[PDB]
Amino acid sequence: SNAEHIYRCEDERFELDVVLETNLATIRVLEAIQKKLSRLSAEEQAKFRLDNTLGGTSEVIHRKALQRIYADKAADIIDGLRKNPSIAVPIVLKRLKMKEEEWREAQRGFNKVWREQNEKYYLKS
């Protein structure tokens, strides 16, 4: 046939599709908060703080995404978000944005090319 057997996409897409979706959701929320921050004062970081923000229901999304990049020190970063938003959020977001583009690069390789190959003419061989 080709090499030996037809190796169709396994779980690779699943990992990327989910992690990118999770990424984008966290990208949105952090950029939203960071924009609302616009560098706040100490008393303002006390006033406007992630009390119910990034939590409630969709916390697992950002929590998991953050634990994936900061596995060992996830608590420290989570605490930072729940404490000093105008400090942690800008930094963590910048880490997340560079990682976003890197994940996007991976998505380009797996998901994007998969899109191309699947929608185009695969032929009858």
Partner: peptide
């Protein structure tokens, strides 16, 4: 090795730097 490298976890270098920055903010 590939066209895209699946790196999910950040290195202790990056992680620790973040922590250093968070607890300092010297800017």
């Amino acid at each position: 090795s590939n066209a895209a490298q699946l790196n999910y976890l950040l290195t202790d270098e990056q992680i620790m730097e973040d922590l250093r920055t968070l607890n300092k903010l010297k800017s």
